[PDB]
Amino acid sequence: XYXXXYX
């Protein structure tokens, strides 16, 4: 992880 979202 380490980026965000949500998908």
Side-chain angles (χ1 to χ4, degrees):
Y2 293 87
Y6 299 94

